Amino acid sequence: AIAGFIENGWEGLIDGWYGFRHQNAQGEGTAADYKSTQSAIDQITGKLNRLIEKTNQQFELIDNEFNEVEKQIGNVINWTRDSITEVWSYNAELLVAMENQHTIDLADSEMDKLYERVKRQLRENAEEDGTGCFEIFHKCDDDCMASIRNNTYDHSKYREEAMQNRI
Amino acid sequence: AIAGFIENGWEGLIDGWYGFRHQNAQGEGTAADYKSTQSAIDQITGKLNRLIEKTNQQFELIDNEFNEVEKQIGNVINWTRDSITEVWSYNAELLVAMENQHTIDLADSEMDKLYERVKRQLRENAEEDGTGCFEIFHKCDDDCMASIRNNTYDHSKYREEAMQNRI
Amino acid sequence: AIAGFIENGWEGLIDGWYGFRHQNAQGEGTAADYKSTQSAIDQITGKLNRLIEKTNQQFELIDNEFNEVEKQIGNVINWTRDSITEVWSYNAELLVAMENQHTIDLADSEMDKLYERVKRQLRENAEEDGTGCFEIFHKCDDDCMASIRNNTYDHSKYREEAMQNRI
Amino acid sequence: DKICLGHHAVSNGTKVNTLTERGVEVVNATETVERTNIPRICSKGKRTVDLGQCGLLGTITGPPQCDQFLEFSADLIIERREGSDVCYPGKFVNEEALRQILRESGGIDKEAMGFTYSGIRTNGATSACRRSGSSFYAEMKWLLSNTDNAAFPQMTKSYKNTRKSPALIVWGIHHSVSTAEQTKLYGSGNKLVTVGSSNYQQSFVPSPGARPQVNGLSGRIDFHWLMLNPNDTVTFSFNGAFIAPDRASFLRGKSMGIQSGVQVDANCEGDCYHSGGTIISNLPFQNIDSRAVGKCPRYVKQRSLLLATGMKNVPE
Amino acid sequence: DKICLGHHAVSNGTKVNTLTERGVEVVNATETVERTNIPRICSKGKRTVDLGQCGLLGTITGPPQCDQFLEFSADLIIERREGSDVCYPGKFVNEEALRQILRESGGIDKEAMGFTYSGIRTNGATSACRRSGSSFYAEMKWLLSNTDNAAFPQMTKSYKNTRKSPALIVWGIHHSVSTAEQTKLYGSGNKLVTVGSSNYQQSFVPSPGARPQVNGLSGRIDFHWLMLNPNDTVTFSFNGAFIAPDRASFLRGKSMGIQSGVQVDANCEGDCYHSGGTIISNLPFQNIDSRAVGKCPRYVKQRSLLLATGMKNVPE
Amino acid sequence: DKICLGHHAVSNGTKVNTLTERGVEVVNATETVERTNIPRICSKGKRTVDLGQCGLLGTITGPPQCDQFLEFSADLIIERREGSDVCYPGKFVNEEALRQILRESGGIDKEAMGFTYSGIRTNGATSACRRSGSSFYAEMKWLLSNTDNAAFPQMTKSYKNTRKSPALIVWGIHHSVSTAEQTKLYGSGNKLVTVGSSNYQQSFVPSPGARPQVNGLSGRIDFHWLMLNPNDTVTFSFNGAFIAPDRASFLRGKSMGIQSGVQVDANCEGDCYHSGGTIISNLPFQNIDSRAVGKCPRYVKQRSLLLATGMKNVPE
Ligand SMILES: CC(=O)N[C@H]1[C@H](O[C@@H]2[C@@H](O)[C@H](O)O[C@H](CO)[C@@H]2O)O[C@H](CO[C@]2(C(=O)O)C[C@H](O)[C@@H](NC(C)=O)[C@H]([C@H](O)[C@H](O)CO)O2)[C@@H](O)[C@@H]1O[C@@H]1O[C@H](CO)[C@H](O)[C@H](O)[C@H]1O
Ligand SMILES: *[C@@H]1O[C@H](CO[C@@H]2O[C@@H](C)[C@@H](O)[C@@H](O)[C@@H]2O)[C@@H](O[C@@H]2O[C@H](CO)[C@@H](O[C@@H]3O[C@H](CO)[C@@H](O)[C@H](O)[C@@H]3O)[C@H](O)[C@H]2NC(C)=O)[C@H](O)[C@H]1NC(C)=O
Ligand SMILES: *[C@@H]1O[C@H](CO[C@@H]2O[C@@H](C)[C@@H](O)[C@@H](O)[C@@H]2O)[C@@H](O[C@@H]2O[C@H](CO)[C@@H](O[C@@H]3O[C@H](CO)[C@@H](O)[C@H](O)[C@@H]3O)[C@H](O)[C@H]2NC(C)=O)[C@H](O)[C@H]1NC(C)=O
Ligand SMILES: *[C@@H]1O[C@H](CO[C@@H]2O[C@@H](C)[C@@H](O)[C@@H](O)[C@@H]2O)[C@@H](O[C@@H]2O[C@H](CO)[C@@H](O[C@@H]3O[C@H](CO)[C@@H](O)[C@H](O)[C@@H]3O)[C@H](O)[C@H]2NC(C)=O)[C@H](O)[C@H]1NC(C)=O
Ligand SMILES: *[C@@H]1O[C@H](CO)[C@@H](O[C@@H]2O[C@H](CO)[C@@H](O[C@@H]3O[C@H](CO)[C@@H](O)[C@H](O)[C@@H]3O)[C@H](O)[C@H]2NC(C)=O)[C@H](O)[C@H]1NC(C)=O
Ligand SMILES: *[C@@H]1O[C@H](CO)[C@@H](O[C@@H]2O[C@H](CO)[C@@H](O[C@@H]3O[C@H](CO)[C@@H](O)[C@H](O)[C@@H]3O)[C@H](O)[C@H]2NC(C)=O)[C@H](O)[C@H]1NC(C)=O
Ligand SMILES: *[C@@H]1O[C@H](CO)[C@@H](O[C@@H]2O[C@H](CO)[C@@H](O[C@@H]3O[C@H](CO)[C@@H](O)[C@H](O)[C@@H]3O)[C@H](O)[C@H]2NC(C)=O)[C@H](O)[C@H]1NC(C)=O
Ligand SMILES: *[C@@H]1O[C@H](CO)[C@@H](O)[C@H](O)[C@H]1NC(C)=O
């Protein structure tokens, strides 16, 4: 009944953006991965820092709300202003559309990087179940689970046993 | 003589964008995957819906084709119009270039997702041949081929036999 | 003491953008992969060809540096010019930011493609060490190393021996 | 036994550009810049006025060509190269501002100004404004001395705008060929025309002087205008050389105006026009005409920009 | 025994748009278009002048409403709908150009021009410019004949700009109701006002003529101006109908000016204003007002554009 | 035994910006904003005219400084700060419109207008237009009464444009220091100059009046112009204060004009100029000068924007 990112997200994960969920004899447990969370957050924070910019350019009135300017120049001014408004309106729709596509793909890409990193820690001791989990082919207690999480799992320790169990 | 996407595309695949091509004792057969095709098409359709937009902004003449306006204002108008044309011409070249790069990568990315999904269905019963195919290490009849295609292949059924054949 | 791209780049690689570094009985050696280098370079060259473009549009003075134009029209001209400058300044910051994101991801993506290609040449004769290297489970002399590099390595030749060594 | 994954390809691939490559082939592509023009003015669903030989400013002064349009209503107004605002030679001052007002006016509704006169002729006419023989602008009156050379009584006439909208007021100054002609018409002495509102006073002097015959006449009547605001009054003081308005104009509502040299077509619908026709397209860009007006794709310099609608084409 | 990798999700997902999809849900999003207006003019840190009933051009001529501002200093200048540049009826010619100069002026410093007079009245006044009874523009002098009907001596007065900055010079022409009134004031004969500098000569004629009473008066004084350059001289020659400047104006430094219908508030700080208040935002875009001025987010048409600040939301 | 895949890196990495990070190091990068200016006007391949002390509008009226350029031909025209259009004091009305027409003209070809005269002096001259002593504008004639104070016969002179191109016509009005001077030259009485074409009638009055001495003279000659169309005629009627054209001008073809304060250099080639030199670059942007003209990179505010041309730099 435990599943990974291929299926869906986890509502229960509140300490982080990405995490680990394990199942062993001692039961179920979930824990956030700090590094991949922060990586993602910082890239988003970097978007914000760039998009929450202020122009330092000052513009002044060329127009008069109370006493309307001469019609010819007014029509040129309005045309120019409306053209500029079209340009910025298009730029702003595009900016957000594009940044959102990128933000989404970026976050997915961090998920993939974590998955791939664990796959490579586990070497020949586990198999991909297809839902974003690894079936580990040896007994993995809370301590062995924690060692996968903090990147200290030594696949040699369990290899002999695991490869034997995969047959 | 059968090969996958790493080598090239398939001219013979007309029912879909992505597909399966198999070789067994009963021979060769090709079939479209509907889901990944549709996913791709819908993302493209979503681009079109966004880029086939109409401006709701109306512009009027500030200029006269029959009786030329006063030269100073005409020159300001033409300069403004030409500047705007440069902006839009650059925006349109960029839009298409960028959307095309994305469309291409997107389609490739759906191919990869399908490949990865099959790889994970097959588990320890097949190996990547390097051209986008799996050498399956057990007898796989038209029914076993169809079960890979429709996501019902149960790798346990064939594991014993397949792992034995991989040595 | 030898490591791959997951860890970091190689200052010692000067004949190319991507490469192979091996360790066998005959020692250590590094060699550039020409194809993946060129692929990357050509994509960058393609960016340059597109961004090093000249406008064919000529603009003329609407303004006078020596004898200032009438104030109303001058203020309209300055407003228009400043608006255009904002547009271009934003376009240029965006162009570079976006192209740089893409260039970086592109180069990473070529690295991944090469890695994946070697992984698939080696089939069941090697394992991923997690740092961008493969531990090869048979004796691989300078000639076997060169055959991995130039895409002629025949995994069948060594399979028997390698699979035996992986247990 | 084996299974492969693949994707489609075709022999008819189309080239497109990307951030990295010119002419990468893809399976399918669609144009993004509109090149296809309909050489008609697609007017369906709009009250259209094809002004023909009537120039738009003539709808206000009413030379013979414009008789049908003195009170026209329109959603779409078409000007033509052949249209003249004028029968007797001359022009409007600030013409283009005024043209722009009338293009978006919806049309015009005329109202009498109520001027009447004593001690003067009111029947000034010319062979240049031909109806049933010599005539004049329908909406104006060429005021003249009661007889040749005779003195033109100094006069004042005022008109108040009762409506809730600004009234377009128009008048004209007659510039005679010679001070001798300007005396025949309005008597000797200097001539002056003062035009006062609350937000506008201005003087006008006829400048008689020789000039080329246009239509065989060397006279010119030049038209001036102003917007009189709701409840405001315009006052006209003059002793000659004044071409007086009979009627004032109020703008009806909303319209768009274009200039064009092609036929109207009430069957096709369109919202983006230019002199050579109508651009019907959902494409975001067009390379037909930079001066297109209405609701339009944005004009770009390039003839073509293909947008990939399929994947890379990798045939064997 | 098993370990899974996952990512978070929530029940409160927000929809955003991407290159490929409308309304893809994400874990978090932030607005990018500012809609929130503060209906006050946030003036903190700026020397503000709320001109009230004083129109900005009146600070130069000095009708009663503008008495407090004849030499005003400001970083920020606020004009109001109720402000009039004028006591006696009339207007400035090239008004908007001048307004624009004064909005960025920083304020003005007046300097006496040194004109004095003989053989004429200098005390022209009107009930329309009310101080302690009839009065006139503080910075001008209505010159009149020494007595009713009497001849107005042809005069010349010149003024040189000693400072290192251009001097704003202003004068007025009086347009009487009738040549009979223009004779009472300045005597019979034709009236002419010639205004010469090095880079400017121009003539001005009073055009007397009937026109609507504004404030019960049918007279108009219309104001003209020019920039006199450092070391340049302006010369005025006239035999009547001249409203002479007493003082010239020099622009102080730098300011910004706006038009507005809401209260000043010296507590909040702002840099982007519009008639209806102040836009305080770091967002790159706004949908409040296209004519906003100062340092502003760029105006866009759309009310909302959400920028994803989290990943796709895939709940179970 | 083992094989690794890697990529290169360097110690000299350069920082660039991306959508997500400021200052990510990459292996190589190239500038995209041009800062490098050549302080010369690179004129190679173009017929260049450095106008020097001759102001561009003087090429039409011909004061002494412009004698070499009365019929100049050019692909590129350079104006200089020191250039004056004028010898006798005054200016062109609508100067900037006219300047813009001449900058793109290709140069000018003069044609005689064929005017001749009786009963008047034609030799009006001034010490301000110095050739071999007192002289005048080469292309104009200062018409004067046959003797001091004497009456200036009312005259008419007309000129038709025979060519297939519009003719630039120019004339001048003399504004005397005093009505007493204007009488010495042209006799007493009021003076009037009427200038009629088919699409243009206008009056001009000299406004004599005291004003500052420029070059020791308080007179001004101000120049007016019009485009006469193919087959059109311009008529001039006057009784004094008229500065008559001798020749009309036709625009040659195509040119570009700039204003500049640096040397010409016929060795380097350039297409993008500004007052301080030439911008030679294929970069798409520049931060040198917003008023650059020709075929130019687009001006941006930023000094630098580096475009990565290599991968991320990850050294050990
Ligand atoms: C020599 C001669 O008789 N010239 C008259 C001139 O001649 C032509 C006609 O005879 C011919 O049949 O038709 C063409 C038209 O294409 C010639 O014009 O006609 C002019 C034009 O005059 C009218 C007009 O507009 O049709 C007559 C109008 O009634 C009149 N309108 C008024 C009085 O308000 C109008 C005006 O006088 C002018 O439009 C104002 O500029 O002119 C006719 O005037 C010619 O008569 C000569 O007039 C000149 C003054 O230029 C002078 O008094 C001569 O002594 C007189 O013969
Ligand atoms: C690449 O190729 C396909 C198929 O191409 C075609 O097959 C042969 C008969 C050729 O000789 C070609 O002439 C023909 O295009 C393209 O799809 C096809 O496009 C056509 C033309 O647009 C479609 O026509 C539609 O069908 C009706 C019926 O007569 C027409 O009247 C309509 O006007 C309508 O456009 C047709 O449906 C379609 N055929 C198939 C099998 O899909 C494809 O567009 C092309 N791609 C590119 C990028 O060029
Ligand atoms: C999706 O959900 C979370 C949690 O939202 C909330 O939880 C419940 C109590 C609800 O009934 C909601 O009322 C509540 O929003 C959002 O994060 C939360 O945002 C809120 C609102 O901005 C924060 O509220 C705080 O409230 C006080 C006012 O008394 C302010 O002074 C604080 O500065 C702050 O704004 C709250 O801190 C925050 N909660 C947590 C645990 O992070 C989340 O933003 C939302 N998604 C989106 C897109 O909005
Ligand atoms: C990162 O570094 C390399 C190498 O830098 C070079 O090595 C050392 C001697 C240093 O102390 C540096 O001074 C030196 O540049 C850069 O590539 C090298 O660039 C240089 C400078 O442009 C090239 O020099 C040549 O110089 C002559 C002029 O005498 C020109 O005519 C040549 O056309 C050329 O410009 C040199 O070719 C090149 N060297 C190699 C081996 O490729 C590299 O560009 C740099 N990264 C960045 C972003 O600048
Ligand atoms: C190649 O790409 C083209 C262009 O993207 C495809 O043609 C497009 O097909 C879609 C539907 O698949 C069309 O949408 C249609 O809208 C119209 C009118 O608005 C409606 O009447 C239709 O029923 C449909 O929903 C779209 O208009 C059409 N575009 C063009 C320019 O023709 C085509 O599908 C692709 N070809 C192949 C072989 O896949
Ligand atoms: C959902 O996204 C929103 C919007 O992006 C997040 O709110 C934002 O959070 C950042 C990080 O805390 C805020 O930065 C703040 O700004 C200044 C400068 O550093 C400082 O005074 C604050 O202490 C803080 O650092 C940012 O202003 C704020 N933006 C908005 C519009 O409110 C929010 O964190 C996200 N929600 C969750 C649950 O993660
Ligand atoms: C670091 O990156 C820059 C890329 O911007 C490299 O400099 C560029 O090198 C290319 C390829 O040599 C140059 O193209 C050249 O074009 C000219 C003129 O068209 C031609 O005559 C040359 O033979 C060549 O094809 C490009 O001009 C040059 N750009 C600049 C701004 O100098 C540089 O080589 C890279 N460094 C390393 C170490 O790779
Ligand atoms: C210019 O725009 C304003 C609204 O911003 C509008 O009220 C005004 O009428 C416009 N002018 C014309 C001539 O349509």
Ligand SMILES: *[C@@H]1O[C@H](CO)[C@@H](O)[C@H](O)[C@H]1NC(C)=O
């Ligand atoms: C402005 O552009 C039009 C064509 O769009 C052209 O015919 C005209 O010459 C231009 N105006 C000037 C003053 O050069």
Ligand SMILES: *[C@@H]1O[C@H](CO)[C@@H](O)[C@H](O)[C@H]1NC(C)=O
């Ligand atoms: C227009 O811009 C220039 C600088 O490009 C500046 O010197 C000039 O004063 C500006 N005009 C006004 C009226 O502020």
Ligand SMILES: [Ca+2]
């Ligand atoms: Ca009516």
Ligand SMILES: [Ca+2]
């Ligand atoms: Ca003072």
Ligand SMILES: [Ca+2]
């Ligand atoms: Ca010649």
